[PDB]
Ligand binder design. Structure first.
Ligand SMILES: CCCC/C=C/C(=O)N[C@@H](Cc1cc(F)cc(F)c1)C(=O)N[C@H]1COC(=O)[C@@H]2C[C@@H](C)CN2C(=O)[C@H](C)NC(=O)[C@@H]2CCCCN2C(=O)[C@@H]2CCCN2C1=O
Ligand SMILES: CCCC/C=C/C(=O)N[C@@H](Cc1cc(F)cc(F)c1)C(=O)N[C@H]1COC(=O)[C@@H]2C[C@@H](C)CN2C(=O)[C@H](C)NC(=O)[C@@H]2CCCCN2C(=O)[C@@H]2CCCN2C1=O
Ligand SMILES: CCCC/C=C/C(=O)N[C@@H](Cc1cc(F)cc(F)c1)C(=O)N[C@H]1COC(=O)[C@@H]2C[C@@H](C)CN2C(=O)[C@H](C)NC(=O)[C@@H]2CCCCN2C(=O)[C@@H]2CCCN2C1=O
Ligand SMILES: CCCC/C=C/C(=O)N[C@@H](Cc1cc(F)cc(F)c1)C(=O)N[C@H]1COC(=O)[C@@H]2C[C@@H](C)CN2C(=O)[C@H](C)NC(=O)[C@@H]2CCCCN2C(=O)[C@@H]2CCCN2C1=O
Ligand SMILES: CCCC/C=C/C(=O)N[C@@H](Cc1cc(F)cc(F)c1)C(=O)N[C@H]1COC(=O)[C@@H]2C[C@@H](C)CN2C(=O)[C@H](C)NC(=O)[C@@H]2CCCCN2C(=O)[C@@H]2CCCN2C1=O
Ligand SMILES: CCCC/C=C/C(=O)N[C@@H](Cc1cc(F)cc(F)c1)C(=O)N[C@H]1COC(=O)[C@@H]2C[C@@H](C)CN2C(=O)[C@H](C)NC(=O)[C@@H]2CCCCN2C(=O)[C@@H]2CCCN2C1=O
Ligand SMILES: CCCC/C=C/C(=O)N[C@@H](Cc1cc(F)cc(F)c1)C(=O)N[C@H]1COC(=O)[C@@H]2C[C@@H](C)CN2C(=O)[C@H](C)NC(=O)[C@@H]2CCCCN2C(=O)[C@@H]2CCCN2C1=O
Ligand SMILES: CCCC/C=C/C(=O)N[C@@H](Cc1cc(F)cc(F)c1)C(=O)N[C@H]1COC(=O)[C@@H]2C[C@@H](C)CN2C(=O)[C@H](C)NC(=O)[C@@H]2CCCCN2C(=O)[C@@H]2CCCN2C1=O
Lengths: 186, 189, 191, 191, 189, 189, 191, 191
């Protein structure tokens, strides 16, 4: 399953060994369980050293918006720069969090994919209940577009237009858009 | 389970519902879907073709169902020349109560222990925010359309109907009369 | 699954399903669970027989575990509305709305066969969701119960209080006990 | 899949399904599990056959595993109520409520074929819920067993005590054993 | 997909194929034997005796058997009625099917050259208390003793031999079934 | 996949990330509230008081709520213990989650700038007799009156306003929740 | 997912799961549905705590919907058997057998938190089969209700008659209502 | 789900699961449905404790609905084989093979707590297939029942005839009734 590594100076699972050097893996669908683990890792690493950079590695299709905002707010709240690196795919809220990294320190590997889209949801019941859920999800999208605007340097209007459908971007296209700063080269 | 009857006028065999239709009675006694709506519409148009002067009688024991199917029946009632009397037996709920109130003025009835339920329309939305936005706007406009027509038929204000249909509202025959959904409570002869 | 019978008169030979044959002699069979389809059949049959003859008695044979309350009331109100006396006969079992409709027959003309069972209960329902939604559903079924007890009081000669108490749990009765209660007038004596 | 028979008749040549053809000669088939649908069919048939002729015998052929007790009593009460003698013939198997209805035939006219099976047992039921609810259903099914045993005592000539002991578990009886018991009167001999 | 056949009269008359065969006193036992099948076969046997008490009846058997009690309903009706019941096996007569094949009128039990015959012991089951399992065992054992007793009388084989021969499934050719005493003749073109 | 963290001592000690946080008096309420979650949270609150009756406890909330009774187990333990319980909403505090957020020590209830807060009425159900439905309705209504009473005291809003505001699902931004009285401060970097 | 606590102790620094840590101070958690597994765990814990110290009080925290009656009586009988006083604290909810065990605590030492719920009701069960089998299960669960009511009478100071009426249907009680009833002794005040 | 306890001696600090801790003091928990896995655990525990000390008593605590007969007999024969007295204590419920094993404990040393239930019954099984296959299965379960009744006769002081009659249906007993029967010697009086 998950391999064990030995350091001379104990036994670590590979993910915990990376955390010792301030690397956090976001490598799954974002639910509350994932979000609370990332949050706790971010807070622990600040408590260890308030000044040294943190590195968030992202291979995620996204998931829950609220779970993603738990991570987003914790990134912005803490003193250290949180560097972000896209490996494989950062989609939806995973791409949102890729863009959330410290300005100048957001990366994607050359063949990594980035996807931007509008939030997904649903409601079943009375017209009033459907009205509430529609107004809530539209306000959630407004909140997402506004932050992405500030993050990428693109206008709210352009982001609305470009996320209307699923938008698949190359690592190059992600830089051009302003979702990342550099394509990390071999 | 559907019984057969014999008439003496030669002689002919009828299923009970076809026999009532002979005397211009239409039965709306199930969940309102497309099949039911198209049946009732065809029945209403046939009875007008036979006689455009004589009254038609729509007996209602229905939990409602599809709003558009209900509206297909509604629009046919209003288009045709004959007065369509409505009679609530057992229960008229949702689109069933809407169609009960759609009967010719002075000619909407309910039996003493019949129940009338009014409610807001039900639906669903899946997918993207804009897809949910369209679905929400559609069902809200559908409700506006329902509330407007009900207002005109009952005499009640649009907002009172908005308030009284927000949650499921169960009314007795007397309460439905007082509300303006019907005109008379049909008492034993 | 229903047998066919052949009938002979001035008009000749006619084939009937057995239930349609009984209907020709003003007998309606209430022999299933009560839903909207059954109710609408009964209602249509009651109205047809009044149109045929508004003086002659109608006969409702009941072998039913009840079912839908609103469906039963569609039958109930139709019985009361039409001019002819509607006799009721319990064969086998009249439970729930079945027993309500048995008590609904014309006074003096309600019967049960010596080994027929009669069951009386309170109405059954359900609610899932918000506290307000549950309140409304509770209030509806309580008012439905009030209506059932009020009518049953008139037909039996018992108080609403006694009916409330006796219907709190499922209450099974013999034919004799149903007669003593006022649900029926007579136990039908064999030949 | 049931066959159609053509018979030359007085009014004219006629096509019947075979079960309806048998009904013409006053034979009713009880050949399935006893539910409310089956019971109401049998009741209608017995009432139709009395209306045609109040004097001539009726013949009820039984190949049934039983089923519903109340549905069985709808058939029982109708048999006893009508004037004509109802003969009972067990073909294949009469079990549970099937065996009860076999025993219910007019005295001297209850038959089983040589290799036919008769099974007698106590009522089956259930209750799930509160202790009060389980008490009611237990008391109800126990009174139902008393009613069945008391009638069986009258019909077979055996004591309630003996029937109680003999029906505690499933009891399979041969045709000759059914005769000795008093469930039937005669084993039907090849003509 | 049961085909309709037409026959001329001094006009014309339509039959489904099976009802047409019954007119010439042929009963088809061509399915698994349950109570529904048994009561149908029993009624046909009784009807055909009523039409003619003298002329032979013909039972055509392509059945894998089924219910034992349903089988005995048919068996006892065959024995009761006065007409001779000829039995013809086409395809397969298994279990209670083969029992009823052997029950045909003496000298009048047939099987087609490639038709198969299977004899076996009765199948059943019980689940519950030891007392319940004992009763169900004693019942099925007595049923087997009843089957073996009659098969002995029909075949000429001893009760002990049939017990041995039916312990497991025994498949017989048409010639073997003749030799055994289950049939009298193999029917040749 | 809960990561292990290592800390130096005058040797070394391993912690799962959540147990490490508890050492500094942080309790994570980051799942649906059931009895298992409640008893875990209750035990942590009681343990931390036992360690130090003076120092603050910190409850971090990312919960969609769940059970009301399980929620009140946590609520009553917060009130009982002497230490001030600070509440911080990350991501979402919904239903009983938002109730427990509002239950934090006065002046010490927080939410992050993009964290969402949802208030609603309690959910339930009953299926059976009218008597059974009445009891279950009266019980859930009384539970709501209990929730609204406490929320009134915590927020400053009237019992009547909260009733109106929780009739349907009400989604609040971190700023709106502050203004409402559910939290005291929006936590800024 | 349950947290691990590190505590400095006399023998040395030690890692505990939080529930085992509480047990060290003589606290047992009853925080799930009561089945045989839960019951045997509680029994073992109560016996272990007597063995360590026969004099010092034990504390049973209850957040339980109830469950099995026999499993509940394994816990009840062990509480009464041991020498130490067993204090009971209702946190969140004590329902059915949960409320019974709350009432079972040493007199003067039964508590509920201000917003904690207490529910009392009659036993739940079932039977499916013969009339004899249903009789046995009905008589068994009725005797079980008598046993529970008789003990509750002793514990709360109310009559068997009152308990019978009050537990017929589900009865939800506030902490203060539980105190007036005598199920608990005290509502636990914020310190 | 099982709590951990820390123990102190000459050998220091040791952490135990609560059931392993009880086993150190020669207590075996029989607190589940009896299958082969449970039986093999009990058998291994019994043999280990004899190896440790062949004089000191062993204690078997029983909270069990029974299960497999052969599994129970593996435990039974192991109890009888080993030299130490094996005391039995019924907590909550000993039903079926659970009650058999309760009666299996050393004479004079079988206990039940005042509210513990004891149930006795006949063994349960099934058979599907040929008449010969059903006969064999019937004969096996009947002989299994003979063996159970014969042993229960010795341990209780009742006749095989009385045991056969009393075990025909599910028979529930109080602790006192179990003592009167000879299944246990003593009802365990509280402190
Ligand atoms: C090994 C474990 C280390 C745990 C680190 C937790 C931490 O840094 N929490 C953030 C809040 C937070 C939680 C979250 F989930 C997501 C976020 F983005 C942010 C925090 O408040 N940090 C404080 C320092 O720690 C605290 O002061 C105390 C004890 C610490 C164990 C827990 N605490 C708090 O949670 C409270 C809420 N924080 C405060 O009391 C102080 C003062 C009030 C405003 C919040 N706060 C601070 O903001 C303090 C002073 C400003 C610096 N300042 C922290 O860094
Ligand atoms: C025995 C079968 C009788 C069927 C009756 C159909 C009928 O009355 N249709 C309505 C339209 C309609 C359909 C529906 F589904 C729901 C509705 F509410 C209304 C109708 O058009 N009625 C006409 C009479 O019939 C028609 O003229 C012709 C032939 C008739 C067989 C079918 N037709 C039409 O469907 C068309 C659409 N109608 C017309 O052609 C004429 C002229 C154009 C406007 C519609 N129309 C009429 O309105 C005529 C005007 C003369 C009065 N005027 C009807 O009653
Ligand atoms: C061969 C088919 C015969 C169908 C018989 C229907 C019938 O008797 N309906 C009841 C209403 C009713 C329906 C129901 F479902 C359950 C009920 F309990 C009662 C009825 O109204 N009966 C009338 C006679 O019939 C009617 O006058 C006309 C035509 C008849 C085919 C249909 N109609 C009505 O449905 C309307 C509603 N009835 C009336 O218009 C008249 C006058 C307004 C009050 C109701 N009404 C009558 O009550 C008339 C005069 C009083 C006698 N009086 C009926 O018996
Ligand atoms: C071809 C259609 C034939 C229909 C025959 C029905 C019939 O005979 N019902 C039994 C009752 C009954 C029903 C049942 F389901 C199971 C039973 F066991 C018994 C019956 O009452 N028979 C009467 C004759 O018929 C009736 O008098 C009238 C009309 C008949 C169509 C229907 N009716 C009744 O149902 C009513 C209830 N019966 C009566 O009115 C008379 C007088 C009141 C007591 C019952 N009753 C009779 O008992 C009459 C006189 C005594 C002879 N006496 C019948 O045989
Ligand atoms: C077109 C429809 C033709 C229907 C043929 C029915 C018939 O033949 N029944 C067998 C009994 C039987 C039923 C069954 F399901 C399986 C069997 F194997 C046998 C019968 O009894 N046949 C009698 C003639 O018919 C009857 O006498 C009367 C009317 C007939 C419509 C029905 N009945 C009987 O069912 C009764 C039971 N039979 C009798 O009453 C007489 C006298 C009592 C003993 C039986 N029985 C006869 O055995 C009579 C006299 C001996 C000749 N004898 C029949 O052939
Ligand atoms: C490392 C483990 C720490 C365990 C902490 C348990 C604790 O604080 N329990 C609360 C009760 C409680 C339980 C719960 F689940 C939710 C709650 F909100 C509250 C408690 O009672 N605390 C006492 C101190 O502890 C106790 O006195 C004893 C031993 C402690 C191990 C367990 N006990 C009790 O549970 C009993 C019930 N408490 C008391 O006996 C005393 C006196 C009676 C009233 C309750 N009580 C107190 O309230 C005492 C005195 C007031 C201070 N006062 C506690 O702080
Ligand atoms: C750390 C491990 C501690 C284990 C403690 C078990 C224990 O106390 N069992 C209770 C019985 C019991 C079990 C149960 F599950 C629920 C209950 F309610 C009660 C018990 O009997 N306690 C004894 C002390 O322990 C025992 O004497 C011996 C060894 C102990 C390891 C196990 N034993 C017993 O189980 C036997 C049955 N008990 C006895 O032998 C003595 C004498 C016979 C009557 C029972 N008994 C006692 O009752 C002794 C003397 C009275 C005090 N008296 C205990 O407290
Ligand atoms: C620390 C592990 C201790 C394991 C204890 C096993 C044990 O006591 N087995 C019983 C057999 C048995 C197994 C079982 F599953 C359920 C039972 F009820 C009984 C046993 O045989 N016990 C012997 C002692 O042990 C043995 O001698 C040897 C080694 C022991 C590790 C295993 N063995 C046996 O299994 C064999 C079968 N036993 C014997 O060989 C001797 C001689 C042949 C007859 C059986 N037997 C004994 O009966 C010996 C001498 C009499 C005393 N006598 C045991 O107590």
């Amino acid at each position: 399953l998950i391999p064990t590594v030995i350091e001379t100076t104990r036994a670590y699972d590979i993910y915990s060994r990376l955390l010792k050097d301030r690397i956090i893996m976001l490598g799954s669908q974002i639910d509350d369980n994932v979000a609370n683990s990332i949050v706790s890792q971010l807070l622990f690493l600040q408590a260890q050293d308030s000044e040294k950079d943190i590195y968030l590695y992202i291979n995620s299709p996204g998931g829950s918006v609220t779970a993603g905002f738990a991570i987003y707010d914790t990134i912005q709240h803490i003193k250290p720069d949180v560097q972000t690196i896209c490996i494989g795919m950062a989609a939806s809220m995973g791409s949102f969090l890729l863009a959330a990294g410290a300005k100048g320190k957001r990366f994607a590997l050359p063949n990594a994919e980035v996807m931007i889209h509008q939030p997904l949801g649903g409601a079943q019941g009375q017209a009033t209940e459907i009205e509430i859920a529609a107004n809530h999800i539209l306000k959630t999208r407004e909140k997402l577009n506004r932050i992405l605007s500030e993050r990428t340097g693109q206008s709210i209007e352009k982001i609305q237009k470009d996320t209307d459908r699923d938008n698949f971007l190359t690592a190059e296209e992600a830089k051009e858009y302003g979702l990342i700063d550099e394509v990390m080269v071999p």
